[PDB]
Design an enzyme around this catalytic site. Structure first.
Site, short mmCIF file in Angstrom:
data_model
loop_
_atom_site.label_atom_id
_atom_site.label_comp_id
_atom_site.label_asym_id
_atom_site.label_seq_id
_atom_site.Cartn_x
_atom_site.Cartn_y
_atom_site.Cartn_z
N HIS A 107 2.42 -0.36 -13.13
CA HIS A 107 1.04 -0.63 -12.74
C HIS A 107 0.05 0.10 -13.66
CE1 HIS A 107 1.15 3.00 -9.75
NE2 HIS A 107 0.00 3.21 -10.35
N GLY A 110 -4.12 9.90 -10.24
CA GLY A 110 -3.66 10.29 -11.57
C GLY A 110 -2.23 10.84 -11.57
N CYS A 160 0.45 9.54 -10.51
CA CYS A 160 1.52 8.55 -10.58
C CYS A 160 2.39 8.79 -11.81
CB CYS A 160 0.98 7.12 -10.66
SG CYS A 160 0.05 6.57 -9.20
#
Ligand SMILES: [Cl-]
Lengths: 306, 306
Positions: free
Chosen positions: B41, B143, B145
């Site tokens: 993503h 942030g 991830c």
């Protein structure tokens, strides 16, 4: 979202941990520049620990009596010196993986990360707090001695603590990096009294602001309080007295949540007087006092080090 | 002595964390050999996340659209490929600080250490558990991830988890290193139901053996129980059913403390039925289920990694 008990990253400290052996006794040491720091009780037998004379014991040892091994490489010792309760062993090679660093003597209430080590290699890392009576509630087996506690700011490692000994009560004690004990304790194996402990009020409040920030809000009350009133309650539950410096430090958290400190002090007082009544806060059924106000802020803004 | 919630040392994982940026979106990635792994993503806008078609979105991107920076050095991307929900970005240079490593899909009940990272640099480390309903209770801001969870055995890093998303309930979800979600979750920003959670019975028992080992023993009872009887109580308190494999795994702890498992099962059942009654265990007022039996053993014997 979420709130965990988090430690600093251990990379930079891991590359400084050496194994020091002197006679039979082996414990951990810290290699920065061209010097190795360790607990000075590495020159003692189990028998010596009962009543050691560290001067006389050291007069027996020479440079070649101290073996220092980093991984597979062996350092050669050029000098040796005793500062308070730590030994400083000068070596021929400087550590190539030495980080920028300071040495700092912290205050009761401050928190730090401990890298736990047996025989110069790392086991694990955890966050903990210097109690008001200058002990700490660690996890330390035989061989652990000379493990260090530190903080990281930006890219600068600040070493604050070196582990020396366990007390008969099951609790831990130790020195700064210049060899001075925190608290009344000495490096003799005898029975030693830690004073009465207290709960760190400023930190409990910090943790309440973290719960509000995360959505846990049931403890919020209509009522309110004064400082002097709040402190009379605190004292009878053996909480640390709250000063204005403490209010000042809580400012940023009071702003972002829009809950005045004294309003939080009133919420706390009710918890003290009525208990939690089988509810939980951030998943705890007790009042947590091991995050500072800087901790909570950092955890919530996601600061990062490099 | 002592018992803490400890994480593995983070050194070896820290030297693999890179920053991946693609358009506006920046998140963390993991650089091993000559490949970088990140959440797929990273090719989405905030709007795309509502209902993304990852095939079509990727057909737009080319190698030069993916910027990867490790500290100050910039990698050049030679290929790119999509495996389940992760992106594999081939680069021209191999990572010099690559540790020996595997990728492993763990089971519910297992524990692991998470290195929390914003923009490719590390923030902090903590221990946590894959819940029975395949979520985890982290601390993860925007942030975060592409932060990873791992275990260390000997000198071998076993990567088990990559963070993808937060659920509306305030809880976290993610994939193994081949890109497969743990649990029913998908990488679309929609409302998703985690099932009913349970408490990990085998781990609560492990933690009781740790308390006995440390001197906290008040919960020990005269009574005793059977498996089937114990499981009838458990179920009505939403505890995980105890099998024989679980008893077998508790063996070493039953030996060193000389308290048979079924005797511990009887101690537990009373706690379930009468609560803790305002006492504490290892300083907790609740029943802790986030140490495995291997954890407790390791913490108590002081294993070490290198
Ligand atoms: Cl608790």
């Amino acid at each position: 979202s979420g709130f965990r008990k988090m430690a600093f990253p251990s990379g930079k400290v891991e590359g400084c941990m050496v194994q020091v052996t002197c006679g039979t006794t082996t414990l951990n040491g810290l290699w920065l520049d061209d010097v190795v720091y360790c607990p000075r009780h590495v020159i003692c037998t189990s028998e010596d620990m009962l009543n050691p004379n560290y001067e006389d014991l050291l007069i027996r040892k020479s440079n070649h009596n101290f073996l220092v091994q980093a991984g597979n490489v062996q350092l050669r010792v050029i000098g040796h010196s005793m500062q308070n309760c730590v030994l400083k062993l000068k070596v021929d090679t400087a550590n190539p993986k030495t980080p920028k660093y300071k040495f700092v003597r912290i205050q009761p209430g401050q928190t730090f990360s401990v890298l736990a080590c047996y025989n110069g290699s790392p086991s694990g890392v955890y966050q903990c707090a210097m109690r008001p009576n200058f002990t700490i509630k660690g996890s330390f087996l035989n061989g652990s001695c000379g493990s260090v506690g530190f903080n990281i700011d930006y890219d600068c490692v600040s070493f604050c603590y070196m582990h020396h000994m366990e007390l008969p009560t099951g609790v831990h004690a130790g020195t700064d990096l210049e060899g001075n004990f925190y608290g009344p304790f000495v490096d003799r194996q005898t029975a030693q009294a830690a004073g009465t402990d207290t709960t760190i009020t400023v930190n409990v409040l910090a943790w309440l602001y973290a719960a509000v920030i995360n959505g846990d809000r049931w403890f919020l009350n209509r009522f309110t309080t004064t400082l002097n009133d709040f402190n009379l309650v605190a004292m009878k539950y053996n909480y640390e007295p709250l000063t204005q410096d403490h209010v000042d430090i809580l400012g940023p958290l009071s702003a972002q949540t829009g809950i005045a400190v004294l309003d939080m002090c009133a919420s706390l007082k009710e918890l003290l007087q009525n208990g939690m009544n089988g509810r939980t806060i951030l998943g705890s059924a007790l009042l947590e006092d091991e995050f500072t106000p800087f901790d909570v802020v950092r955890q919530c803004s996601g600061v990062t080090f490099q």
